[PDB]
């Protein structure tokens, strides 16, 4: 639609993560490529990223090459950009045919010349929301009657930003012309909630004039979003495009989204990422497993139960992948990649265990993390 700004939203691709792993080495490149491919196939007006583009502060030559190759092949082309800039931006360059402009803030992993400066200098990404006293200035875009005021705050040490907000040292700049017509979009890369009272960014701290908050840094996919009643805005945490640890947060299926803006209204469409390796986690408390009698030489029974839980997790992972592809397990069809499987086992109350590497070895050629399938702990 001529009055609908269509933005592909994602965050935390971590290009280069696990590059050296023989099984997982290409995951970050394939999934960062997927995000750009979906944007092109779905004919969006622009891409908006929430930071942590590269895993390493100084990306490897392979990581940089792969990111540049994907951006060049998916973002350049004959497609006209229908976004009018009201207040340099790559699509306005007369020597580069930008079909889909990419906008990104920096995260803490992409810390004078960041890897993001390199993406910008090539004309492939618009690095915005720089934090050199913080002055948050918008990028003003128009498509028909729709007016977008895009704001960004690049990653700042959580305590430093929290103190800056407390000492009222954060300056949000608003356009005077077409005052209340602008759809206000904020992009951040901070902790959404931490044990420390100063290590995170509370939602209440964010100005209520904002309509939408794109929340980077947090890897868990919470793509459906959450409404803040006091501030009157809807926070969307798209999550990462790769699991950077085997944490419970990393298990939620990865998605990107299309944010459709018509006037001051929006429609968020969620898109399941097909290239993300399945990750299943099981949290087990042995004392809650009646089958296993406590305080006796129960290794055999502990092992039988845990082996059955890995098997169950593999079956769920394979099913999760076929679901993502819209396919069935048949000879003509591509087979799922090896899944990431993790059992967290609480062994309190008298239960014998097994060496984690010896346990993991029981699933060689069946799991992507053949070294750390199980973790035994005491509550």
């Amino acid at each position: 639609n001529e009055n609908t700004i269509r933005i592909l939203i994602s965050s935390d691709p971590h290009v280069g993560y696990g590059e050296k792993d023989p099984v997982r080495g290409n995951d970050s490149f394939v999934s960062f490529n997927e995000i750009l491919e979906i944007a092109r196939e779905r004919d969006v007006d622009m891409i908006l990223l929430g930071g942590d583009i590269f895993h390493d502060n100084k990306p490897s030559r392979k990581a940089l090459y792969q990111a540049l190759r994907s951006l060049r092949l998916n973002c350049l082309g004959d497609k006209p950009c229908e976004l009018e800039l009201l207040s340099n931006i790559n699509y306005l360059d007369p020597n580069i045919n930008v079909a889909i402009p990419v906008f990104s803030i920096h995260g803490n992993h992409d810390d004078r010349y960041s890897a993001l400066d390199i993406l910008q200098v090539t004309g492939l990404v618009n690095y915005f929301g720089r934090v050199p006293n913080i002055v948050v200035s918008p990028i003003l875009l128009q498509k028909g009657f729709t007016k977008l005021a895009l704001y960004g705050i690049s990653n700042v040490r959580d305590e430093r930003l929290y103190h800056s907000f407390r000492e009222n040292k954060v300056k949000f700049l608003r356009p005077d012309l077409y005052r209340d017509e602008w759809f206000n979009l904020l992009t951040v890369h901070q902790n959404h909630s931490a044990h420390t009272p100063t290590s995170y960014l509370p939602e209440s701290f964010i100005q209520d004039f904002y309509d939408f908050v794109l929340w980077g840094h947090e890897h868990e996919c919470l793509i459906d979003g959450s409404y803040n009643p006091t501030q009157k805005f809807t926070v969307v945490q798209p999550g990462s495009t790769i699991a950077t640890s085997l944490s419970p947060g990393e298990t939620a299926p990865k998605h990107c989204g299309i944010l459709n803006i018509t006037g001051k209204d929006f429609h968020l469409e969620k898109i399941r990422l097909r290239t993300v390796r399945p990750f299943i986690m099981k949290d087990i408390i042995l004392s809650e497993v009646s089958s296993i009698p406590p305080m006796v030489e129960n290794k055999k029974e502990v092992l039988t139960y845990l082996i059955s839980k890995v098997e169950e997790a593999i079956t769920e992972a394979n099913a999760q992948w076929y679901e993502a592809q819209g396919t069935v397990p048949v000879v003509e069809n591509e087979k799922p990649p090896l899944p990431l499987i993790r059992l967290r086992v609480d062994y309190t109350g008298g239960y014998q265990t097994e060496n984690p590497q010896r346990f993991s070895n029981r699933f060689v050629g069946r799991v992507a993390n053949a070294t750390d399938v199980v973790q035994f702990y005491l509550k």
Partner: peptide
């Protein structure tokens, strides 16, 4: 933290491509 709100300050200020071949 849940108490304070709207921290900092809020103040006011005053085809589309050029490629061809």
């Amino acid at each position: 933290n849940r108490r304070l709100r709207n921290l900092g300050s809020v103040e006011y200020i005053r085809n589309f491509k050029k490629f061809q071949k």
